[model samples]
Target: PSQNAIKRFMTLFSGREDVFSIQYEGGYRPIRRPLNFQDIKNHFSGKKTLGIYLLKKNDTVKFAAYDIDIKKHYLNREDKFVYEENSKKVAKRLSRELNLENITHYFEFTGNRGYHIWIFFDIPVSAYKIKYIMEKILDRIELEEGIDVEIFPKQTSLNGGLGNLIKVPLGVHKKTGKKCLFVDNDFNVIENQIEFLNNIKENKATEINKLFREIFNE
Candidate 1:
């Protein structure tokens, strides 16, 4: 099950394969060595959750993400319902709009309380281009207030630091022990997760660039 799963995961999520960050309780520990198959296995087996850098060494990225989560400070509320529901509303809004906009993306539950909409590319697009495109996309999408909407490749270039990474999907959240998985429009975990990942569509660089131009032109 993991062999095919690994290939599909990597094919869609590939970033800096040589190195990745590991997530623990308090903070991330950066690893400079090449990722081994064992590490991938460990992530799937719930041993750890992998944090993969979106930016490659060449200032490019294979994918970027739209992260929707509650504000950390807001979680201290005596009543958690308001804060919890806000992020969910934002996530759902973005998902449906991205559908109408025809952007190819995956809606995933982060195994904790967050959701991420990942946009994968068929070619290695520059971090600068992708970041601008993502920002513009967010501007066009209607988002609710009080929820945090963050995107990956937060930096256009690493500048000798590993840019923000996302937890690899369908892996257990090391701290929470909850397994992450893809979700449909209704937010239920999609069935046959691996099959869905295997068939997910990738965005075209030229098309995205065209959209960028079109948005600016209009």
Candidate 2:
């Protein structure tokens, strides 16, 4: 299970070099530079949650994401059902509007009443472009859903420091004491996680760049 989990994570964050693990009570500790199979074992050996710095100093970002916290930005009550239902609708609408049927999407439980919608690419794209795309999506989602969504990599680019770190999937949620796993479009937990991870396909850089230019003219 451990090996499968690590392999699955490495596949999701393929080109990412810097990764970190956070303890329930303690802060983050750097896992490895250019994460390897062995590092995955070491990191998951404990009960800490996993996270990845979206922006790299080289100006390349592996993923673009939208974080929707029900408690923080949406309703005050801890209603997972409502949060999940609303998030599913927003994700489906965004996917249809953007015509991102082929793009990879990951819905992760924050170990709390929140969800992180992650879009991955085959190759790293410019941090600025990723941020631009995420912002555009967020604007549309908020306007339609009437709920605020925060984008990852809060900055356009990394300024010689960790730009923004996002909690990764497949880890223990410290607060809820629940296992964080990937969910389907309908927000159903994937039972065969290893199979699901193996099936994930990356988006080609050329296709992503082409789409960005066509959409933003930049």
Highest TM-score against the true fold, candidate:
1
Overall lDDT per candidate, in order of appearance: 0.79, 0.66
Worst 10 residues of 1 by lDDT: 137-146
Against the hidden reference, what TM-scores do the models get?
Answer: 0.89, 0.81
lDDT of 1 at 66: 90
Which of the numbered candidates is closest to the native, going by highest lDDT?
Answer: 1
**Residue-wise C-alpha lDDT for candidate 1, range 85-175, written one tens digit per residue:** 6777888777666776677888888876678888988987888777777777677666555577888878877788777778878788876
Q: Where does candidate 2 stray beyond 4 Å?
A: 1-5, 15-21, 26-34, 42-46, 73-84, 100-102, 143-146
- Model 1: lDDT to the true structure: 0.79
RMSD in order of candidates: 2.1, 3.3
lDDT value for model 2: 0.66
How does candidate 2 fare on TM-score? 0.81
Candidate 2: residue 95 Cα off by (Å): 3.1
